[PDB]
């Protein structure tokens, strides 16, 4: 339950930001049946939006990262991605950002 609240705290923050008392009663101007339908629809969409277990998210992530590399001072792009995935003690443009 602690991990579940930890997972949904950002969406709960968004829900409280949008469905506040002042914004509903002043800007949004819904009615009681409309508000209940909104609560039911938000609950239904969030329940249908959970990641379906058994989904092979690893190969999907690998494809979703490998595809934008195809479409394209310090080095960037394909050689920098090569230097990232193949971790090397030296790189083309070693840089430091001191604040």
């Amino acid at each position: 339950q602690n991990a579940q609240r930890d997972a949904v705290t950002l969406f709960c923050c968004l829900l409280r930001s949008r469905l506040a008392t002042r914004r509903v009663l002043q800007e949004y101007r819904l009615t009681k049946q409309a508000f209940d339908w909104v609560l039911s629809n938000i609950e239904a969409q969030f329940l249908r939006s959970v990641v379906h277990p058994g989904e092979m998210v690893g190969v999907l992530a690998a494809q979703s990262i490998g595809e934008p590399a195809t479409q394209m001072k310090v080095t960037s792009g394909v050689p920098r991605l090569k230097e990232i995935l193949n971790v090397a003690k030296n790189m083309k443009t070693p840089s430091l950002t001191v604040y």
Partner: protein, 112 residues
């Protein structure tokens, strides 16, 4: 902090040309690269050294050497990976095959 810097660097590479990728794929990549306490490279001597079974380690590169090092050490392959079931042709434990279906009897007699 190494994982955070890795995620920031990969994000910089991805969005250098303006292409955008969702966070969760990047998080999965950097978490796999930092799941062993060190920056495990995606090379032949990186992720292919973990004892995840001989067949997935030999599917990527150096098949014969991995099969030698498995046969000397007598590694027991659990056959839960994707490539093991692909080689053996049986249904992989992914997607529709990530569960099993039985037939019910209480509901079946309950309907009629």
């Amino acid at each position: 902090a190494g994982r955070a810097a890795l995620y920031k660097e990969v994000y910089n590479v991805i969005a250098s040309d303006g292409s955008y990728v969702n966070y969760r794929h990047m998080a999965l990549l950097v978490d796999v690269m930092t799941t062993q306490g060190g920056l495990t490279s995606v090379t032949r001597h990186g992720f292919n050294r973990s004892n995840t079974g001989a067949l997935m380690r030999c599917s990527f590169e150096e098949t014969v050497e991995i099969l030698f090092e498995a046969g000397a050490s007598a590694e027991l392959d659990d056959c839960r990976g994707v490539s093991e079931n692909v080689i053996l042709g049986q249904m992989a434990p992914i997607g529709t095959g990530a569960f099993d279906v039985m037939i019910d009897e209480e509901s079946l007699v309950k309907y009629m």
